[PDB]
Every structure is written in C-alpha cells, then in structure tokens.
Design a protein around this ligand. Structure first.
Ligand SMILES: OC[C@H]1O[C@@H](O)[C@H](O)[C@@H](O)[C@@H]1O
Ligand SMILES: OC[C@H]1O[C@@H](O)[C@H](O)[C@@H](O)[C@@H]1O
Ligand SMILES: OC[C@H]1O[C@@H](O)[C@H](O)[C@@H](O)[C@@H]1O
Ligand SMILES: OC[C@H]1O[C@@H](O)[C@H](O)[C@@H](O)[C@@H]1O
Lengths: 448, 448, 448, 448
C-alpha cells in the first residue's frame, strides 16, 4: 500500500523567470537575469527568458492545465523586479496585479497558492548597489516581503523566503555560471551570509505583519563514500559542508560548519553574534528541493572544495547528468528530520527529472517513460520516509511546464506538461498523466 | 493507406565487427587501427574501447536466437580483416576464420540470409604501418582479402558488400582525424578516398573471377537542402553536397570526380591516371544505402575544407547523435539515388535507425524507447513511398541489432533495437525491436 | 636639429600603488578589490599577486635615492584608497596616511615634485560590496576620499590626478572581466563609465572648495588607423575609436557621449540626466595622457561589443605585451588631443614606456635594454615633433620607475627603466633608465 | 682565465633544408611531409610555411659570403630528400642534386668544410604514403638515398650525419603529433623509433660499402635534474630520462632498450628480433650532440606517456622558446655522453644556440641581441670546461646561421646569429654573430 497520510498536499512548481516572459511588459523592472541572459556566451544557444512559456499572458490556460492534473497546490515565485522595478520604493501596480489575478484564479479553482519571495531574479537596481554583498539587502528583502505578506494576507498562507541559497551563491558568486556571474570565494562567503540574514529578516517581518507559515527552501545533495581512503572521506566532508551544511547549520543555530575555514581559507570570515541570532529566527516549515546524490572523491585541483563526484555508471542518468537513485531521497528526508529534531514540518518543494522530448507533440502525446519511472520511484521513496517517521506534508513536482533551465536554456525539459516553444502549445506528458492519477488515488495507483 | 511491401522484400538488421565482437586479441586475432586508436588517451569518450563490447564473439549463438525472435530474414555483418588475416597479408588465422564459418552456418540454418561486408573501418594495423589507405597497393591487398572470403563462403554468402561508407572512413579517419587512424590532412584525404574507390573496384574484379552471387558498395548519403535563396549559400550547399554525397558516387558511376572538389581541396587536389577510373567504375550488381538524416548547409568561410555549416532545424526532433529527424528526405534520397543509377541498379537500405537515451539496465525486463519506435515506423513508411515512386528497393536493414560501441562516442550512443546491459551482457528487446518483429511478420501491414 | 625641450618641461617616472607597494594588510590597511581578485585562482598569470611586489612600502627611501640617480624632476604615484580609509568611508587609518605623508616629504626634500593620483584601480572592497562603480553614491565617497588627501597635503602636493584611465577601469573591470572586480557585462560597463566620470567631477568640485593647486584626469588613448579602404572597416574603426578614445573625452569636453556608443552597446546603452553631464564637464587645470601604441582595427562581427579587431602590423616591432612600436602615432595623438582640448588645456604625457624580456637577475650589475632604450629615444623625439606643431605639452612621465606587477599578466611583463629582482628586491638601473637620466640632464640635447 | 681551444677544433654554424631553402616545388623537387603538414590549417603558428623561408635555394651564394664574414671553418646543413629523389625511391632529380653539387663546391672553394645531414625531418610525402617510418623497408629506402649522396660527393663531403634527432622526429611526429607527419600514437612511436635506428644502421653499412669519410648519428639530449627528494619524482625523472635521452643512445651502444620503456609505453611496447639490434649498433665514426637546455621533471600522473612534467626554474633566464639558460648542464651532458660512449667516440656539439626577440628589420644596420650574446659566450666556455675534463670534443656548430622557420612555431622564434628580414630577405649580422666571428678567430681567446 502506498496511500499517503490525511492532508498530504500534492502540487507542481515553477519559477518566475523560467516561465513568465514579458520581461519589460507593463512597467516591469530589469533583473540580473535580464542582463545576464543578454550577454553573449552566458546562455546555451543564446536562449533568454524574454518569452519563455509566455505564462504572463497564458496563465489562465495554465490554471486549466493544473485542474486537469488535479493539482491541490501550485508553487510559484514572485518576480521582485516585476512588483518593485527598482527593488526599493515605487510599486508597479500592473505587475503586482498579475499575481493578484493569478492567486485569486488559483483559489477559485480550489488550488492552494504556495509563493516564494526569491527565486534568483534580483532587481538589477539592487545589484548596482552591491546585491547580496550589501548587508542592507536584508532590510530591502524584508520590506519587499512585507508588501506581499500584507497584499496576499489570508490568500497565500504558506510562504517560502529564499529558494536554494546554495545555488544562488555557488552559481552566482563563487563560480559565475549563473547571474550575476561573479567568480570569487570572498564574495561567495559574504553573499551566503547576507542571503541567510535576509531570510531571517523576512521571517521577523512576517511575525510582525504576516499570517500563515513561513520557511526557507534548501536543496540537499547527499554525499556518499567513494572508498575507504581517509582522503576521500575528508573530501566527502568538504563537499558536504560546502553544499549541504553551509546554510542548514546556522539556520539551526549551530553556526557555520567547521570545514568552511578549510574550504574557503583566506576568504573565510567571522561575523558578529547578532547576525547569527537573526539568521536562526524560528520558522514554521522547511522546503526540500531534491534531485540526486553524489559520490565525492579527493580532487586536489578542484576549487574550492578539493572534491569531485565519481560517475555511478550502474544507474540511469538524466539529461542534466544527474544520477537516478531514489533511495537517497528517503535517506535525505530522514537526515533532515533528524537535523530539525523531527519537529519541523517538511515539504518536498521540488523533485523531478529532465529527459529529451521532441519540440512538438506527436499524435497529441508526449511519451516520457523515464520521467514516468523517475516520478513513481521517487514518490515511493517519499512513502518510505514517512513510514520512518518523517513529518512530511507535501510534494511539488518540478516542473509544471517545460521552461528555461537557466544557463542551460530550453534544452533541458523538466515539465510534466510539454511546451512547444514555437507555438506555445501545451501538451500533458505521460508523466503528467500518471501524476494526475497519483493525486486522484492519493498514492493508491503506485500499487500497479 | 496500405504499407504492404513488394514480394521478396528482405527484412534484417545490421552490425559491425569492432562495435560488437570484443575478444580483440583472442585466438590469434591481429591488431587493428581501432585497437591502437581506442587505447590512446583522449580519442574515445569516457575512454571506452571495443575490448569487450557486446561480447558477440563468445555470445553469437544467443544473438542468433534473438534474431529469430525478431523474425529477421537477413543479418548484415562485417568481417574483421585482422581477425582473419592478422597481418593483413599472408598467413590466415584459422580459428578467427572459423568464427565466421560457424556464424554463417548458424545463420543459414536459422533460415537467415547472411549479408557480409568486407570492410567496416577496422584496417589491420600492419597494413596501416605500410601506409594504409594511402598506399596504392591496398587495392590488391583488399582484393586478396576479399578472395579468401569469396571462396571460403561461396554458395553460402551470396550478397556481398565491399566498403562500408567510404566518406566516413576518409572524412573521419584522414581529413579531420576523429576516427582511426586519426590523421588530419586534406592531402591524405584526397589520396585515401581514391584508393578506397580503387580497392572497391579491385574487389569487384576479383569477385567476377572467383566469386558467386551479387556484390556492391555501401554509401552513406546526407541530402543537402537550401538554407536560403542567397547564391553564396547555394554555392555552400553544392560544396557540401559534392564533398559528402557525390565524391564517391560520381566516379563509381563513371563520371569522374565532382567538379567542386578542386575548389574544396585546393592545392591538396590531384589528378589521377585514367586506368584508375576504369578500375573504380567496375560494374556492380547492387548498392547499399546507409541513411539517417539530412542537412541544411549555409556559407561558412572559416569552416575547413567545404566552407559550409549545417543550420540547426529547431522545428524538428533530433537524436542523441544530434541528427534531425526528417523521413521525407529519405524518400527524396532514394528517388535521387535511383535516378543517379538509371533505375537499373537494385538498391537496399543497408542501415537506418536512431540513437536515444536508454537506461544502462532493463527496467522490469523492458526497455521503452518511444522515439526510436516513432523513428522506425515513419522511415519504413518513407521506404514504401519511395517504392511507390518506382525505386527498385529490395531490402531494409535496421541499424542496429544491438546497442554497441559507437566508435569515438563510445557506449554513450545506443542504436540497438535490442538493449545490451554492458555490465552483465544481458540482452533485452526494446519496444522498437518488438514493433520491427511485427513489421516483418506482417510485411508492413501492421503500419496499416 | 635640436631636440631640446621648452623651459619648465617636467621629467619624471610613474608608478601605481598596488603594482609596487606590497604590505597589503600592514598597519591597519584595508582590503581592496585587487586583494580579492589576485587571490582567486585563474585570474593572474602564474598566480602572481601584489602581496609583496617591489616591497616599496618598506623600501621607499631606497627607491627615492634611485629617483635622484635618474635625475628625476617629478615622481608620479597613486595613493591606495583602502590603505588610507580601510572601509572606503568613515574612520581614517593614521599609519596608512602617515606613509604617504612621509613619502611626499621625502620627495619634496629630495627636490622631486610629487604628482599624486587619487584612483589607480584599487577600489576598497567595502565599497565594491556596496556596488562599487555601479553605485552613483561613489561620486560622494570619492570626493570625501579626495578631500582627506587635498587637506592633508595642502601646499605639498600641488598637481593632482583624479582617475587613472577610466577606459581600462571599465573595459577591463566591468565589460570583459580581465581586471578587478572581474565583471563581464555591457549593462554594467555603461553605468560604471558614467559613475567614473561623475566621481571625477565631484572630485574636482571638492578640490575647488578645499584644495590648492591644479587638478585633472588621466586618459589612455590608442589611436585607431585605417586597415583598408573598405566601408565595413572604417565603420569598425569608428566603433573602436568611439568606445576607447571618445567615450570619456567627449563628455569631459561637454560634447556628450559619442553617437556610436548607441550602436556598440545596443540594448545596454542608456540615457542619463542632463545635470550629470554638467558635473562631468567641471573645468580642469590639466589633462594627463597615457600612450603606448596604436591599433589598426578591422571589421569583426563576432567580436563583442565593438565588432572590431586589430590587424597585426608585421612590418614593425612589437613589445612583449604585443603592442606595435610606432612613435609617429604618439605625435599624431598629441596633436589630435590638442585639437580636442582646443589648445586651452595643459597636457602632460603621464605614462609612456615599453615591456621587453629582461633576465630575472642582473648580469654583471647591468641590464642591457636595447629595444626599450630604442623605444624611449624614438618616442621622446615624437614629443618634440608634437611640441613643434604647438601642442601645449608640459611634461613626460616614464612608465615605469620599477619593474612591477603588470596586473593580470603578473610579474612577467617588465616596464621598468629600473630592473627589479623579485627574488631579492635588488634594484639595477637598466640601459633604458640610463639613457633617460641623460635625456633629462641635457633636456633633450643628448638626442641630437 | 684561459679559453683557447685544441688544435683542429672546428668552428661552424648549422641549418636545415626545409627551414631555409624555400623553393619547395622548384626544378622538379618533390613533395615532403612538411609541405603537406605546413599547408594544413591549425598546424603552424600564424599559418607560416617554408614556401619562401630564407630563400636560400636562390641566395646560397650570398649566404656563403656571410659564412666567410663570420670566418666559419665549417657549415652544417641537411639535404632535402624529396628535392633529390622526388618520389623517395627511383628516379633522381638532376637539377635538385645539382643544387647541392654547386653548394658543396662553393663551400670547398671558400675553405669551408661541408657537413651534410641525410635526414632533417623532411621525409618525402610519397614514402609517408607507404607508411613512412612505420614501414620497416624505410631502412632500405634510406640506404639507397644515402648511396646517391655518398657517391655524388665522394671525396668532397667527408663528414656525414645520418639522422638528425630521432627523439624529436618520433616524439613530435608520431607520439604527440606536434610535428609532421602529425600522428599521435604510442604504438606508432615505438615502431617509428625502431625503424629510425634501423635506418641509421642501414645507412652506415651502405656508407662502408660505397662512401668515403666519417659517419655518425646526431642525438639531442636534455639532461634531467631532480625536482625534489620525493621517490615519486625520481621515478618520474627516470621515466623522462629514459624516453628522451636513453631511448636511442642505449641501443646505439649495444645496450638494448632502457627497461623503463616497458613502463612508459605499456601495452604499446614491443620486443624486436635480435638481428635488428646488430644493425642498429653498426659502428660509427663520430656522434653529434644537439644541446640547448636541461629540465627538472616532477611526477605528473596525467601527463602522457612519461607521467612527468618540468618544474619552471624561475631563478634563471629563459629563452623565447621557454628553455632555461643553464650552461653547467652542457658541460655535464658532454661528460655523461663521453662516459656513455666509452670515451672512444669522437664528439661534436653539432647544434647549440638560443632564441630571443629581435625586430623584423635591422636597426640602423645592426641587431643588438645581448641575451643571445650572453648565451653564446657562457656555453662556449662550458665547452672548454668539458674538454678540460677529458671529453674528445672536435667542434662546435652554432644553431643557427640564419633566422629561419622554427617548424610549428613559425618564424616567431629567431635562432640566427645572422638576422633575416623575412619581408626583404635582407641579412644582418647580429651582435652574437660578431662575437662568434671573433671567438673563432682567437680560437676562443676572447672569452679570456
Ligand atoms: O531544473 C533544476 C532546478 O533546480 C531547482 O532546485 C531550482 O529551484 C529550479 O529553478 C531549477 O530548474
Ligand atoms: O553512426 C551510426 C552508424 O553509422 C553507420 O553508417 C556506421 O556504419 C555504423 O558503424 C555507425 O554506428
Ligand atoms: O599596461 C601597462 C600600464 O598601462 C598603464 O596605462 C596603466 O596605468 C599601468 O598600471 C600599466 O602597468
Ligand atoms: O630540437 C633541436 C632542434 O631545435 C630547433 O630550434 C632547430 O630549429 C632544429 O633544427 C633542431 O633540430
């Protein structure tokens, strides 16, 4: 039996820049990704989110698709620069009105709106003032949060602050593969600290003006042993500290992992005690974004963790090159439950897989059997976790739609609904068909 | 819509020695250029080699059993020159010859037509040390090698292929160097191309003297379509077309070399003795077509040596090898090739198929490959269209029978209609293979 | 022909703080962007940093003795912003200011005129974290920094430079990312350039309020010559000329931004408030020119963003930095710059010199410098030619006094007229600085 | 300090055919592998070829005058195989052979001893088409080629060299592919090296039959020094040493192949029949040493195939080809080579010199090359040190007489003691050449 607990919430997730398009429309401001994507060499095939899924225009169609999928929740992000073009100061009413209509549409459809404040699209105007390197951003972010907290009070009840601080910082400040495209360990350390402070400040503001539940969203990639060599275990700890514990540990009031002094070396810094008090402001829930695991070994020339993943050729890999290994999802959920004392409600806010699909539907269908297989095995892994006592309250499939996979462009399809980027025609994939049935049966269909 | 095929139409599947056999040093087998090439670092993806491959040398009995499950009427395979004659010239390796002796007898008795190819890219290293395809004497070495097989398998193998894809042998092996023997030279490419043709002609002459049955060459054609109405693009198209599709076909048809090659190869181009062209044009009994895709070339001044590059056709699906999926071009090519041969040369599609990601292991004893399924059914229909237009097409060989070593791309590119678990050597018939077996049994009727 | 120079013509040598000082953390000095950039792997050739450099912070007295041996009449240096004001704003570091206090006293006492530059590329990291040159507030930050020096050195430093080479600051640091802070964005480049201009103006205004002497900016100019008669190439030349040579000069002369920048920077280009340009065009008392070579631009469609690239001038010598040796272009540039200023602005060649290979140690107390010696003779002569056509040229600063850290190219590029053995810090006067010392003594007569 | 050399000690300068002659197709000359290699895009720096070079084929009389101006007692040159025998075997090219006929007569009449090298890397393309150095027959082709020269210049050329630098021929041409014929294969490298040795032996045997004078091989040696006291590094040093310095010397001394080569080349290594080693160790009359620098190899697991890499010796000067300047290593090498040959073989430094930047044209009728001057004097001194230690050194040939085509590095690397302006073909004696002319004249007394 794979029936899920009472009240278990099923949904799907997106992000603003990945689906919306209409980057300049109706007074929308300029974001770091507007700039980054229009700089040559940054994006695969020169792709941008200028059009994407055209969701800003086709959201009503997209809500209809959600209903066909029997979604009970829809997780989305708000574009900071669409609502507050200069990041601070004047509101863009028409921009804010889009989310206003969207949320009401969802509520009328009986779909719970789960909003994320920040999904990587920082206003360019704030980047010009230092972005995540400017400690004032904690205040700017809380103010932005307040606007949505009050505007949507009683409508959006479950809130996420930051989506994946690691990717934001590792990609955007440490290695430069993502906006704003900086490459510096000095900046990475500072950016990481201010992301945490910003989350904390947003939660404090939420206690003052908000209604419902608030939490952060972390991606975790569990690190498994490559050998019995002590050098590899040390490497595994470095990889694990830099990716999985960097943010979780201070969030739990335990300070930064000890290994970061070694990983970041001279770039490492100590911060005032009041910062850590702020960062550890108690939350109501936490989101887990999960896709795969890694098997790190020692890699002396790899900067800065001195580690590299060992290819697990015994298992399938997705088109993004990620190992398919559902037991590690169960392990990670158990681990995170322990890290939170089993007292913090958990929600898989993202999980899914990318495989090749044709650019157009065939016979009005898209057959994606590997995405189908990934979906069912990982949902089963959720059930195993719940059986081991993990307080897990929901699952959001990434993603609702094929979309802009950031720097990898449109070449990587994560959607359970196929998007023809030439015609904007939507087609529900076989994965989406199965998912709609998983929801209807509350897991029962996984028996067969 | 009826897709019933002509009476006597031959259905089979194809492989090549180095891609499936393994046992590279076993039982007195000689060293080939691919034994050397694959064991040189940086040449092969993931450092893959053909040392084990599908272990077909050991498991051929199992594979014949698979052919019977697929209802195959023919099996197209290549003979390893260096397995049969270790030094390329001189002493026979009896136990190596015995493998093909057993294989053919096994096939005949299964009621399967053995279609043998003399050369599928695995030149003996000992001959490479004597210049390989750059030594004009290779025409004679090849004829001698052919004679051994012609006489040994007389009355058993009745349909013979000489050279499989002279273009890939030369473009890859001598012009750009991505394939064995890994040379990069326009000067050598011109010469190697000429001797490949001469070697083919010499083998046909030898066949008339000592052979029994039908003999021909196997060409790959990639039809070149217009990118625009710009004259410089049409000139680009003609260059690309001449270098890839007409380079070998024209002198094989007694029309000398394409005029554009003087422009393409410049100072590397040469004139050859008239007696060479007499040899090259030695009349054949049939011709094989290897076909996968089309291209849409545009002018590209810095592209060496044709000054052309393909325009990505984003409107259509692409395989994992990056090839556009477009079956009408197959119909067009067959008509074109029929015209170029006056409609009097029997044609056979000796290779056609597609590469898509498959997991490294079967899942519940199945491999679901819907895009390979779709490719298969659409291109087989495209054959029927060609036959309806008067093309003398007498057979179809699916590439490939097994997932195998895709040369420099290693095992990462799966062409098989039968899945091979390269960890365990377990075979699993893919959904594409299941459909093909039904296409054969119904002689096309399953397509309607 | 006499190559004697007008009375009052000032002879000197030039350096920059980060390139020579070392002692990055010494005596409460702050962290700069070059402290970060240089310690990030892959940014610097051979992993060189400015941690030690010429150890000038410790050896400045010895170096002043060398200036005397060279018969220098002026010494041009830069003040390290973060050494004086560690956080860029607020609390002053007394000891950091004490060093420059002592240095200036030492110069005047030795009879050598101190020419201070406010900004030579080493922005405080604290200010970079607030947006750096992307934050419009930096004009105020810079002015306050300038005031601290203007007052401190009232009556001692009489000739002031504000910004050293805005183009290199922006093109290298924000457009292409080859220099600190290592950003790569046309959007940021436009904004940074504007704020660099604004900061210059605000500095000049503050100077009028609180300072005694003359003040000006220092531009680098690289004259663009025709590569052919082709229209495309002439358009390329304008784009190249506009982006490098006119971008800053034109608004400094109140002529606005060059029209071609709209074409070069496309969607990244922006229009600014008219009040900004009035601040930018604040009257200066002089202008400095950095000159080394010319360029011969041709059309290059894939070269971003000017769509131009230099044609190698094989008929002439090239320095180790790859710059063509062509002294006539210095004469032309000086005339051109005189035209652009209107003859009403005093000019001073504030950097000129060349890099050639020298051994890492002196050979028998000597460094034989024939090509650098030759460069100096031919280029000093070209000044006279300019003075001969009535350009108001009032001085010449040789780059550089010492072999130093050539930024990203590390210590591998030696510009010094004095050799520095980076292994021992031992100084050795090159033949180049030795012809130079003689040129001053004879005031240009030795050149006849 | 006394630096007078023994009576009879022979002073000269050296060139190679392809590097200086030009006139690649002139007067019935055949095509070589370097004609092909150099005209393939990507192979040569700046796309440089030897089509013109120093135009020596046309200007050899002017050059002979230069040798007299330099008071050369000897001129070491190579004969172009394909210029004399266009197809490598068969018909002789009269006018091609006539060129070397007149050249030798001009030298003798000028009192300059002609030192001919049979093979300086320019294999006939026609023989490369037969496998080149991978074909065991090449020993006979080379012997036949030698005989043509041995008889033509009987009594006129008395000192003969067979192979110039087997290591560079094989390491560059067959192992790494940086030189013609551009192959990259350890399997081919092992075989090529063996046939080069066999060809050397066969040529010496033929010389005994039909020639007059003294014959020997020319080896390059690059002495390997310890990088540390780590065992991993000493093993790397031994691997590097065996593959570069002992690979050819040891079998030439009847000592067989170094045992480390089974470790360096692994599965590519082969055993050869005992008869071959008799041929290889065919007694010679003298041996040449090409020497320029040393190396300090450390362990490099990823470096193929020796798994070693040189540690940059920053304490010393390096030439423009990146070679450390360290004269004591020259003395050590000569002592080593003397010991290896039992002291009973006469030796001659047959190449030594250095590359530094020179302008493309003379500055007024002079080229001041102080670092090349310094290299020359310090190394000629190191020769004297060697002779003082008992090494039977009989002469010294400066590499090179003229600035020429430095193979793949093009004309960018100047080794000449005489400057060549490749725009005008005008020659100008460098200061190094002026010093050399006096060193000869005082028989070393100037070094005093
Ligand atoms: O597809 C990879 C995904 O990684 C997730 O963790 C991010 O939240 C998504 O925006 C992204 O698309
Ligand atoms: O590239 C896919 C296939 O192309 C064919 O034409 C070759 O004969 C095969 O060996 C290869 O696997
Ligand atoms: O590139 C050589 C020199 O260029 C000058 O314009 C810069 O001001 C120096 O700091 C630099 O060393
Ligand atoms: O490796 C030694 C080689 O050095 C090069 O600089 C010369 O040009 C060659 O002729 C010589 O054989």
């Amino acid at each position: 039996s794979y029936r899920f607990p009472e009240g278990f919430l099923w949904g799907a997730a997106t992000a603003a820049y990945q689906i919306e398009g209409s980057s300049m429309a109706d007074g929308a401001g300029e974001s770091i990704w507007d700039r980054f994507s229009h700089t040559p060499g940054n994006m695969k095939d020169g792709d941008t989110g200028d059009v994407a899924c055209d969701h800003y225009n086709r959201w009503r169609e997209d809500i209809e698709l959600m209903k066909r999928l029997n979604l009970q929740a829809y997780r989305f992000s708000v574009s900071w620069s669409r609502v507050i073009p200069q990041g601070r100061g004047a509101i863009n009413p028409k921009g804010l009105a889009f989310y206003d209509r969207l949320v009401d549409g969802l509520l009328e459809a009986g779909i719970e709106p789960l909003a994320t404040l920040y999904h990587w699209d920082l206003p360019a105007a704030l980047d010009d003032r230092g972005g995540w390197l400017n400690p004032d951003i904690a205040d700017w972010f809380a103010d932005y949060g307040q606007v949505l907290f009050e505007k949507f009070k009683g409508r959006v009840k479950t809130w996420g602050t930051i989506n994946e601080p690691w990717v934001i910082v590792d990609g955007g400040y440490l290695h430069g593969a993502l906006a704003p495209g900086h490459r510096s360990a000095y900046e990475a350390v500072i950016a990481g600290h201010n992301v945490l402070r910003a989350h904390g400040a947003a939660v404090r503001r939420f206690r003052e003006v908000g209604e419902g539940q608030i939490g952060i969203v972390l991606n975790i990639e569990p690190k498994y042993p490559a050998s019995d060599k002590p050098e590899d275990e040390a490497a595994r700890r470095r990889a694990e500290a830099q990716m999985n514990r960097w943010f979780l540990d201070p969030l739990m009031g335990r300070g930064y992992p000890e290994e970061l002094t070694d990983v970041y070396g001279a770039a490492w810094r100590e911060f005032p005690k009041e910062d850590f008090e702020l960062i550890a402001e108690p939350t109501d829930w936490m989101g887990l974004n999960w896709y795969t695991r890694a098997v790190p070994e020692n890699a002396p020339d790899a900067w800065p963790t001195r580690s590299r993943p060992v290819r697990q050729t015994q298992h399938a890999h997705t088109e993004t090159g990620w190992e398919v290994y559902p037991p590690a999802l169960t392990d990670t959920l158990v681990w995170l439950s322990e890290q939170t004392g089993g007292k913090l409600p958990l929600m898989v806010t993202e999980n899914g897989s990318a495989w090749y699909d044709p650019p157009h539907a065939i016979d009005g269908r898209i057959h994606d059997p590997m995405r189908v297989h990934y979906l069912q095995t990982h949902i089963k892994a959720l059930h195993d976790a719940i059986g081991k006592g993990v307080d897990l309250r929901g699952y959001m499939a990434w993603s609702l739609l094929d979309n802009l996979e950031w720097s990898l462009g449109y070449s990587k399809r994560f959607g359970i609904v196929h998007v023809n980027f030439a015609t904007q025609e939507r087609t529900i994939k076989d994965s989406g068909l199965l998912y709609a049935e998983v929801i209807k049966t509350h897991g029962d269909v996984l028996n067969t």
